[PDB]
Amino acid sequence: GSWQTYVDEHLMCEIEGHHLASAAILGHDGTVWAQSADFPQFKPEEITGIMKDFDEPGHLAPTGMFVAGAKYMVIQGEPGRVIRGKKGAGGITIKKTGQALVVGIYDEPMTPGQCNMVVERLGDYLVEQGM
Amino acid sequence: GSWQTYVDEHLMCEIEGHHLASAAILGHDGTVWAQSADFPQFKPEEITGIMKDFDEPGHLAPTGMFVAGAKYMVIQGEPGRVIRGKKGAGGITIKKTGQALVVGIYDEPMTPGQCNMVVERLGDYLVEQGM
């Protein structure tokens, strides 16, 4: 399927020696359009907090951001468009499109530049598609 | 610049252990919007033959396709959208957008799948942008 190929041959691609640990494309309601093998199960409250942070940035920063019950420290993101979090050497990037969330989870520091920025680039592409 | 970053941090990215030898984004008139360091100089006749092949597919197949005077054997492509050529272990991929040509040149066989298909993915993105 189109959405599975976006995960397996765009988001999960090894780039400059590094690959996401996991990735998925979800609806604004947290429905899984497509996902990687080790992608975590979000809780509805977690998706609601992410969505509230996109509507009003700074919502998640004081308490942190939870993913399958794992705490992530909110770090700088693009307001209303991207939410970034850090846990240990890894982190999470969430890009919001008109109809979807693109999610990438990393276990290791990525290379500098846009080469590894697969979550943001796929989200930009779907937005230009009107999705 | 936006067009240079597309070349340096999208097209020239190392992906699954392989990187393009060279890449560029050109107008339909062969003007260089942005290019890699070792990108070749196309001749106007070469750009005209590529453009004629997009307007009428099969134009270049009998005589081959010339890039800086180097012969490439035309191989299967998407008619009106993509032109692919082979020279030795390497090859060339040309994707046509509404206003531009995306060009990638490889010295080595790429990995199977869309992960390495940077020329086609950038061209799709610009087309969705209306470019």
* Cross-strand bridge partners of residue A22: A105
**Which residues fall within 8 angstroms of residue B128, CB to CB, at 6 or more apart?**
A125, A128, A129
Q: What span, in angstroms and rounded, lies between the C-alpha atoms of A7 and A12?
A: 6
Beta strands in A1-131 (DSSP E): 22-27, 32-35, 65-67, 70-75, 82-87, 90-96, 100-106
Q: Which two tokens stand for residue B76?
A: 């299967």
**Distance from A130 to chain B by nearest Cα, in Å?**
9
Q: What span, in angstroms and rounded, lies between the C-alpha atoms of A29 and A40?
A: 16
Q: What span, in angstroms and rounded, lies between the C-alpha atoms of A38 and A58?
A: 28
Query: What residue has token string 């040149």?
Result: B105
In terms of Cα–Cα distance, which of B34, B7, B21, B128 is closest to A122? B128
Contact A128/B at CB under 8 A? yes
Method: X-ray
User: Which residue type sits at B26?
Assistant: L
Q: What span, in angstroms and rounded, lies between the C-alpha atoms of A120 and B5?
A: 14
Contact A14/B at CB under 8 A? yes
In terms of Cα–Cα distance, which of A36, A39, A83 is closest to A60? A83
Residue A20 CB burial class (10 angstroms; 0-12, 13-18, ≥19): buried
Phi then psi dihedrals of residue A60, to 5 deg? -85, -20
Q: What span, in angstroms and rounded, lies between the C-alpha atoms of B81 and B47?
A: 15
Smallest Cβ–Cβ distance between B114 and the set A10, A113, A121 belongs to A10
Q: Which two tokens stand for residue A109?
A: 């520091």
Cβ atoms of residues B67 and B90 within 8 Å: no
Give this entry's resolution in angstroms. 2.3
Q: Which two tokens stand for residue B43?
A: 């001749």
Q: Which two tokens stand for residue B107?
A: 């010295």
Q: What span, in angstroms and rounded, lies between the C-alpha atoms of A92 and A107?
A: 9
* Cross-strand bridge partners of residue A93: A84, A104
Q: Which two tokens stand for residue B67?
A: 């890039």
Strands B100-106 and A22-27: unpaired
Phi then psi dihedrals of residue A83, to 5 deg? -120, 125
Which residue on chain A is closest to B9 by alpha carbon? A115
Q: What span, in angstroms and rounded, lies between the C-alpha atoms of A106 and A85?
A: 10
Q: Given CA atoms B110, B21, B51, B71 in this order, what sign does their dihedral have?
A: negative
Q: What span, in angstroms and rounded, lies between the C-alpha atoms of A130 and B115?
A: 23
Q: Which two tokens stand for residue A57?
A: 């940035």
Q: What span, in angstroms and rounded, lies between the C-alpha atoms of A27 and A25?
A: 7
Phi then psi dihedrals of residue A51, to 5 deg? -65, -40
